Paper text:
The Alphabody scaffold is a computationally designed protein scaffold of about 10 kDa molecular weight, which was developed to serve as a therapeutic agent. The scaffold does not have a counterpart in nature and is composed of a single contiguous polypeptide chain designed to adopt a triple-helix coiled-coil fold. IL-23 adopts an atypical heterodimeric structure consisting of a p40 subunit encompassing three fibronectin-III-like domains, which is linked via a disulfide bond to an α-helical bundle subunit (p19) that topologically resembles long-chain helical cytokines. We show that affinity-matured Alphabodies can bind with ultra-high affinity to IL-23, but not IL-12, via an extensive interaction interface that engages the p19 subunit of IL-23 to abrogate IL-23-mediated signalling in vitro and in vivo.
Crystallization trials of highly monodisperse preparations of the IL-23:MA12 complex yielded two distinct crystal forms that allowed us to determine crystal structures at 1.74 and 3.4 Å resolution, providing the opportunity to visualize the binding epitope in detail and to cross-validate structural observations. MA12 folds into a left-handed triple-helix coiled-coil structure, with the binding surface located mainly at the C-terminal half of helices A and C. In agreement with the ITC-derived stoichiometry of the complex, one copy of MA12 binds to the p19 subunit of IL-23 and is oriented parallel to the longitudinal axis of the p40 subunit. The respective binding interfaces feature 20 amino-acid residues contributed by MA12 and 28 amino-acid residues contributed by p19, burying a total surface area of 800 and 840 Å2, respectively. Five hydrogen bonds and two salt bridges are formed upon binding, while the rest of the interaction interface can be described in terms of van der Waals contacts. The binding interface is further hallmarked at its two ends by two prominent attachment points. At the other end, Tyr110 on MA12, a conserved residue in all matured binders, inserts into a pocket on IL-23 p19 defined by the BC and AB loops and the N-terminal part of helix D. Furthermore, we note that this segment of the AB loop in the p19 subunit of IL-23 is disordered in all currently available crystal structures of IL-23, suggesting that the interaction with the Alphabody induces the observed conformation. We were intrigued by persisting residual difference electron density emanating from the Cδ1 position of Trp319 in IL-23 p40 up to the last rounds of refinement. Indeed, mass spectrometry on tryptic peptides of our recombinant human IL-23 confirmed that Trp319 in the p40 subunit of IL-23 is mannosylated.
Residue numbers in the entry:
A (entry chain B): 27 to 141, 150 to 189
B (entry chain C): 2 to 28, 46 to 72, 86 to 118
C (entry chain A): 23 to 279, 284 to 328
Write the structure that this text describes.
Amino acid sequence: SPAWTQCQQLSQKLCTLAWSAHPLVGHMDLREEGDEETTNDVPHIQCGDGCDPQGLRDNSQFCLQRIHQGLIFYEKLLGSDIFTGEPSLLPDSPVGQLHASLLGLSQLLQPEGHHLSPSQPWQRLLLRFKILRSLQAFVAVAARVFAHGAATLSP
Amino acid sequence: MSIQEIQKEIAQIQAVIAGIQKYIYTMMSIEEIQKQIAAIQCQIAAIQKQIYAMGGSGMSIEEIQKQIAAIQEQILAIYKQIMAMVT
Amino acid sequence: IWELKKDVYVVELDWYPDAPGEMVVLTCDTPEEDGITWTLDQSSEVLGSGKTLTIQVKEFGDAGQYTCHKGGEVLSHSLLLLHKKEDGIWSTDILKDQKEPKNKTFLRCEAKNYSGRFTCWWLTTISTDLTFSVKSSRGSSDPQGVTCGAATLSAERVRGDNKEYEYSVECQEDSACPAAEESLPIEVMVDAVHKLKYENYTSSFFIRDIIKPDPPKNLQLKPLKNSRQVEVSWEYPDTWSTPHSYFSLTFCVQVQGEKKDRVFTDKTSATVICRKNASISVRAQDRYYSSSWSEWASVPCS
Ligand SMILES: *[C@@H]1O[C@H](CO)[C@@H](O[C@@H]2O[C@H](CO)[C@@H](O[C@@H]3O[C@H](CO[C@H]4O[C@H](CO)[C@@H](O)[C@H](O)[C@@H]4O)[C@@H](O)[C@H](O[C@H]4O[C@H](CO)[C@@H](O)[C@H](O)[C@@H]4O)[C@@H]3O)[C@H](O)[C@H]2NC(C)=O)[C@H](O)[C@H]1NC(C)=O
Ligand code: NA
Ligand code: NA
């Protein structure tokens, strides 16, 4: 359920790339009052989604379904005009490699699983910082889940 | 445009260029790009004095907004150069 | 004018020399309707009669404790505080701007782990007549409960030929989810009152961004006979989140006493080369998310 050590290796790589692929801003930067509504449309590993250690011991399938959903979501975002539009990032860029790593992990979880936008270049750039720091938070939780499962759930 | 909005735009621009600056450390002339970044940061400081003061003269609000837009274009050009260098 | 807490009110003022201020009407909190008089602070001068008192609030001499009386007995009190707005900006006289990570940073917060507990600190030059009140929530539009203790002095030091007083407060999210991905930030709100001057301050953050682990525990060196090689070992700090198999740390091991001889590891041991007067130092970071490094743990070489 499925290849814990393989998911651990790939999710660790995702954390490295999420932080190295693109310039960063400070966590207090680029914040604004409407962020509360913007956050609502993004998927998160929330309280009660089953990704805590006890939930993983009881039945890890709930958590892994939520991780898969989040990976699919961020893959669609990183492949969208937010990132491919002016100033354009190429598929072979570090951000393009980050997109490919999201896909690699989601494929490992569900092999046969199936896979808003600003118009000004400056606003695209700002949104990239915001999306990628959200992704950093998501993939950190995923990496803890897989490290713990590899350590405690691997027969 | 309000002074509050203008200061918000400046804060965003200061955050983005600081991040680009740090990103360059982690990695067609790098020294040249770092000098251009520092020059933009320098100009932001000069502009901030024009704000906190509120054929030749100082700057109006409109002229500050126009310079911010121009700085944003310079940042985008630098960003595109860096992204091309790491691809 | 608005009510800060029972019988305590804040009057917002556009603050400049000879400003006219604001007209306020105070109502005595009483059933009585006849024979009422008003005073301010210690003076017995009757400022007005009747159920209500109209006053012009424009400087600190107009602030303070307004008292209504009948039959020589006190009926009620109303403390007025002033919130100065100077050139469209609320005053920040009471707290020192720490200017990091950016301008107008008055509160700094840190968490040792993902428990939902955190600590906030601030600095002031003021020694007397000073009150703070701290509240917190998760989310602003739909606030979730956070319980904070009292703010109290944590340090006193001299900076620039004058005393600097440091305050700290401890807070705990009521229903925390250490493993979850936070989507709404913690908000911290600090009221500050110095004499009759009211100010307030805010910080907003995710716990994951203010994480700073305690230093590595039980740092030990095992020297190798006939060599300067040493085996370094340590343990996770007691306060870090458990289980460690989930909340993993990563470590930086450095030998120093000009250059930077460092290695990074996820293990709790490493082999390095010592030299005299040098120390081996180790510090810790969340393995999966770039928040702050711990303070160094250090042991001398040899
Ligand atoms: C940090 O400091 C700031 C600045 O001082 C504080 O901001 C003030 O907060 C107070 C308390 O919330 C605000 O006062 C309240 O405003 C409410 C909305 O008022 C607006 O809308 C009405 C129209 O309905 C206008 O008439 C008014 O002028 C405002 O534009 C009111 O609903 C509140 O009234 C309360 O009392 C009356 C009786 O007195 C009751 O009938 C009401 O039901 C209600 O209980 C109150 O007046 C004030 O407006 C804020 N100032 C600014 C500039 O925004 C922050 O609150 C403070 N931070 C913290 C954490 O305390
Ligand atoms: Na101050
Ligand atoms: Na030795």
